[PDB]
Every structure is written in C-alpha cells, then in structure tokens.
Amino acid sequence: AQEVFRNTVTGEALDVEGQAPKEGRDTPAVKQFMQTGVDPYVEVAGCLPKGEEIYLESCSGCHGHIGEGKVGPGLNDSYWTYPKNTTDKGLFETIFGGANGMMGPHGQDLELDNMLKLIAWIRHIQKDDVADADWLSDEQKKNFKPFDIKAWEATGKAAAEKAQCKIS
Ligand code: HEM
Ligand SMILES: [Zn+2]
Ligand SMILES: [Zn+2]
Ligand SMILES: [Zn+2]
Ligand SMILES: [Zn+2]
Ligand SMILES: [Zn+2]
C-alpha cells in the first residue's frame, strides 16, 4: 500500500495529491514510487539529462551546479542534515514539503514524474563512497562511480541524452 508522506522537519502530513501538479502522475515510475517509496529512475542514464535540467534551473543557485553547496548545503556527499534523505522516500519528502529557512516546499512546482528524475540526478552527482548508500541496491553499489563533471560535460551527458528514460 501507499506510502504516507510527512514533512522532514515537522512530521506533518504532506498532501501529495492535493499539492502536486495534476499532470505527470500517470507513469509507471510514479505508480511504483507512490506504493513503494523507491524511485525506479535512480541510475537510469536515460533519465539524467532531464533531472539535471530541473536541478540547474531551480536548485543549483543554492545547492551548486554539481550539488557542491552554496547558500545551501552540499547534496553530493555522504553527510545529511536529515539522515532519512539517504532513502528516496525521505529525499522526496524534503523536496516536496521543504525544510527550515530558505529551503521551501517544491511539491507544488514539480510534476511527480519530474520529481523522480530530479532525485535520480541528485543520486548521480554523489562523489563520496556509496558502500553504505541506503538508496542504491546491491548491484548498483557495484557499478556506481563518483560523479565527474568533466566526463559528464565531455561524453556522459551526450550518451545519457541518446538513451531512454524508462524503468526496469
Ligand atoms: C530544488 C528543487 C531543490 C532541491 C532538490 C533541494 C534539496 C535539498 C535537500 C535534499 C535538503 C536537505 C539536505 C540534508 O538533509 O542535508 C535541502 C536543504 C536546504 N536547502 Fe534546498 N533544494 C532545492 C532548492 C533550494 C532553494 C532554491 C534554496 C535557496 C533559496 C535552498 C536552500 C536550502 C537550505 C538553506 C537548506 C538547509 C535547510 C535545513 O532545514 O537545514 N534549496 N535542500
Ligand atoms: Zn495506464
Ligand atoms: Zn555549482
Ligand atoms: Zn550533504
Ligand atoms: Zn521549486
Ligand atoms: Zn553543465
């Protein structure tokens, strides 16, 4: 059954159906996420360019173009202020409902399917060791390499763009 989503800092129920855009919910990826809390776009290369464009436009002014940190914290390291952000469910809740200070809610802004691609991008830009990563499966941990923006700009993004964004 359905996940119940709660505000990261308060525990108040997030009204996902009430607040999310009407469009972009009817995808296999969203249906699995709303049931499971696991984001099936994670480490699907095909979903990454779109996650990156969303990120750059709305998040990187504060969190940095590669998640390095600016006004707001780094998102590309092993350390989390709110440690349930090591799960896709927690990260979704932080993004959807917001946190303290200048971190406001973005639930109302992003179609659910796009939210999931954004989260895949955030996972992809990780550059610390992932052996303990709560958001990767056993096989994914075996294949995950620290993000290198140089490779991404040279070859990574081009190849991602030619691939399909679809779940397994
Ligand atoms: C855009 C949609 C965007 C994303 C994505 C995002 C993510 C994010 C996370 C996951 C956290 C929690 C980090 C952790 O647990 O360690 C977090 C926290 C803060 N952010 Fe953010 N953020 C997005 C957008 C923006 C915008 C545009 C701003 C600045 C105006 C901003 C800033 C902040 C701040 C400040 C925090 C710390 C909040 C806290 O409670 O500690 N983010 N963000
Ligand atoms: Zn259908
Ligand atoms: Zn940057
Ligand atoms: Zn961090
Ligand atoms: Zn937003
Ligand atoms: Zn770039």
What does this structure look like?
Helix 3 crosses helix 6. Helices cover 42% and strands 0% of the residues. It has one domain (1-168): Orthogonal Bundle (Cytochrome Bc1 Complex, Chain D, domain 2), CATH 1.10.760. The chain contains eight helices and no strands. Bound molecules: protoporphyrin IX containing FE (HEM) and zinc ion (ZN) (5 copies). The site of one zinc ion has 3 residues, from loops.
What features would you highlight for this structure?
0% strand, cytochrome, binds protoporphyrin IX containing FE, electron transport, 8 helices, monomeric, binds zinc ion, 42% helix, monomer, cytochrome cL, mainly alpha, Cytochrome Bc1 Complex, Chain D, domain 2, electron transfer, 168 residues
CATH domain class name: Mainly Alpha
Cα-atom radius of gyration: 15 Å
How many individual domains?
1
Number of DSSP strand runs? 0
SSE inventory with pairings:
Blueprint (H helix, E strand, L loop, with lengths): L15 H4 L8 H9 L11 H11 L1 H4 L24 H10 L14 H13 L13 H6 L5 H13 L7
Helix pairs in contact: 3-6
One zinc ion binds next to loops.
Protein name: Cytochrome c-L
GO cellular component, one term: periplasmic space
Organism: Hyphomicrobium denitrificans
